[PDB]
Design a protein around this ligand. Structure first.
Ligand SMILES: N[C@H](Cc1ncc[nH]1)c1ccccc1
Lengths: 237, 300
């Protein structure tokens, strides 16, 4: 069934599972034409496919060429997502294939189910959680590799950096979703928090700064404040 | 014109014959139904006065034997049987007619309703779905489950209706996932019409047989089958023009015949709204759309 607050620790058990977020697959800028009509121009996108237990991120970059000459792009984007997720599963050794795929948007269920008919034992699940994975393109290194791509490309990351050496998956996922929620609600502020102290750097092979345990507590606190704040500036409280 | 005699009527029962019905009182002197039109399959069906639970009945064709009804007090139902002694049967019938103990199949001359509901239904074709080979007539009741329902338990008592499943490898060609899911023409025309059914007459007939079992017995799996067979056509962008025209006529007469007070349970809102207003064939069912809007505008 649907993944929600009640069955949340299931994410960190030992059954392989992936989240799939298709938000950033089809991305456009809307602009005016010389005649004063409106048109779109696509920019490169990405499928966000994440193992929440290990942090392994399968970032499939969607190059604008995939849309050339196609109609109904928002609908096609969901089927392309499902095609590429199915291809990824087929590429993995049997013992690495997921037992469940959780889609962050319900409109991905039928496309993914149909592409995975060959995998009747892989459960395709929606969720009631409002996860902030759309903000993935606010992570500078992820945004950079998507925008620079000249062809379809899969890039592998660990979205937790080395955090699992010191904390549990549950805590790592909580930190990730807090960071991404903050970047989604107020990107400039969030990014200011993360980069303020210039003595804390991002390792070449990491996505996030090299905070000590104590510095992460301060960081996490500052992100919580931001989210309540912006929730104030938005609703006025 | 043919006859289905009754040995007797020992328990109070509502008897249907096709779209007609009449009440028979306990031990009322009733000995059957005469003047049944030849050339069509027919259904004779029953609802006991004391247990409206279980409507049940028998599809039969009088061209394929002499059939009669006899109540069984052990199994508690009216059973159809075949009389193989033709002279014994003619004698029984002639004597019952002479004593005017039979109701007459009450067909108005103008009225093509039953033809229109059964145009592609035959007795031999019916037995391919309802399996009991030792008899010529076929038993159906309210509770019988379909093969597809059993996949999701007694196989001998099942309705072997063609299994249609839009999210199945049969329905979806590898590499045409989006194409085949959004436009079911492949599945309709190649898999089902050319591969399994063999022709449009086969498709319409199973679709018609599904509706009639839903209507007469409240058979839920039959209702599921009827709607799936409609949806598969309406969700295909490429359908032979003769099939669309015939489908409109078929569904028109089904909607016309449906009891008004049963629409709530026998009509699936999603399928009909999708079929009449969103599907590829939203503009191809003029007669069906008109009667649905004037008779069930609430469902829509
Ligand atoms: N069995 C046929 C149609 C069919 N062909 C292949 C599978 N089903 C049918 C037609 C008419 C009345 C009832 C049943």
């Amino acid at each position: 069934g649907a993944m929600n607050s009640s069955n949340y620790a299931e994410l960190f058990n030992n059954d392989i599972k992936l989240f799939v977020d298709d938000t950033n697959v089809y991305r456009v800028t809307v602009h005016k034409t010389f005649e004063g009509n409106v048109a779109t121009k696509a920019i490169n996108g990405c499928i966000f496919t994440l193992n929440p237990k290990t942090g392994h991120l399968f970032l499939k970059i969607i190059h604008t060429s995939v849309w050339a000459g196609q109609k109904r792009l928002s609908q096609l984007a969901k089927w392309k997502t499902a095609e590429e997720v199915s291809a990824l599963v087929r590429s993995l050794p049997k013992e690495e294939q997921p037992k469940q795929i959780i889609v962050t948007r319900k409109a991905m269920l039928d496309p993914l189910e149909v592409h995975m008919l060959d995998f009747p034992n892989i459960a395709i699940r929606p969720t009631e959680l409002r996860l902030p994975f759309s903000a993935a393109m606010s992570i500078d290194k992820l945004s950079d590799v998507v925008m620079k791509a000249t062809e379809p490309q899969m890039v592998l990351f660990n979205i937790y950096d080395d955090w699992l050496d010191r904390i549990s998956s549950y805590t790592a996922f909580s930190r990730l979703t807090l960071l991404l929620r903050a970047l989604k609600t107020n990107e400039e502020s969030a990014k200011m928090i993360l980069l303020s102290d210039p003595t804390i750097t991002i390792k070449s092979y990491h996505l996030w700064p090299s905070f000590t345990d104590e510095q992460w507590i301060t960081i996490e606190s500052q992100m919580r404040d931001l989210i309540l704040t912006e929730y104030g500036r938005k609703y006025n409280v | 014109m043919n006859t289905v005699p009754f040995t007797s009527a020992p328990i109070e029962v509502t008897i249907g014959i096709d779209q007609y019905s009449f009440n028979v009182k306990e031990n009322q002197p009733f000995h059957g139904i005469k003047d049944i039109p030849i050339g069509h399959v027919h259904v004779i069906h029953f609802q006991h006065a004391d247990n409206s639970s279980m409507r049940y009945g028998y599809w039969f064709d009088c061209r394929m034997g002499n059939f009669y009804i006899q109540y069984d007090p052990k199994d508690g139902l009216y059973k159809m049987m075949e009389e193989r002694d033709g002279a014994k049967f003619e004698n029984i019938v002639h004597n019952f007619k002479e004593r005017q103990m039979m109701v007459s199949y009450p067909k108005i001359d103008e009225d093509d309703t039953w033809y229109n509901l059964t145009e592609f239904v035959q007795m031999d074709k019916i037995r391919k779905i309802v399996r009991k080979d030792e008899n010529q007539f076929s038993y159906v009741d309210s509770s019988m489950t379909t093969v597809q329902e059993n996949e999701l338990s007694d196989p001998a008592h099942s309705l072997n209706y063609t299994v249609i499943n839009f999210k199945s490898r049969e329905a979806i060609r590898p590499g045409h996932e989006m194409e085949d899911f959004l436009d079911k023409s492949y599945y309709l025309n190649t898999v089902m019409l050319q591969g399994i059914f063999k022709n449009s007459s086969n498709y319409f007939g199973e679709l018609q047989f599904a509706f009639l079992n839903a209507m007469f017995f409240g058979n839920y799996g039959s209702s599921l089958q009827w709607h799936a067979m409609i949806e598969l056509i309406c969700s295909s962008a490429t359908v032979p023009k003769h099939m669309l025209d015939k489908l409109d006529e078929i569904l028109y007469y089904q909607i016309k015949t449906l009891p008004e007070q049963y629409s709530d349970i026998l009509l699936n809102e999603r399928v009909w709204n999708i079929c009449l207003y969103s599907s590829f064939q939203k503009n191809s069912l003029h007669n069906t759309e008109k009667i649905m809007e004037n008779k069930y505008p609430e469902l829509l």
